[PDB]
């Protein structure tokens, strides 16, 4: 098993798009950041002030675009 980012691992301290929020790219709470498996990207689901009451672990979460497909 290897780190999700092998290009900025040394610069993990710096912000990089490969391992950061897709839109803002900030890290307000990456632990609460969900990634879409079909698109493999992070979503503002956690960047928004209002947090989710519960986070699904067994059920993979898909971005609205996937469901709107």
């Amino acid at each position: 098993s290897g780190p999700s980012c092998k290009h900025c691992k040394d610069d993990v301290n710096r912000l990089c798009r490969v391992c950061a929020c897709h839109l803002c790219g900030g890290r307000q709470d990456p632990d609460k950041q969900l990634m879409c498996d079909e698109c493999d990207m992070a979503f503002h689901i956690y960047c928004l002030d209002p947090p989710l009451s519960s986070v699904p672990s067994e059920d993979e979460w898909y971005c609205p675009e996937c469901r709107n497909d």
């Binding site: 098993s1 999700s4 391992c19 990456p30 632990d31 969900l34 990634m35 059920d59 993979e60």
Partner: peptide, 12 residues
């Protein structure tokens, strides 16, 4: 859901 192996909160 999927998360990154590296996170700001890391423990030994």
């Amino acid at each position: 859901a999927r998360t990154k192996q590296t996170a700001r909160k890391s423990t030994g």
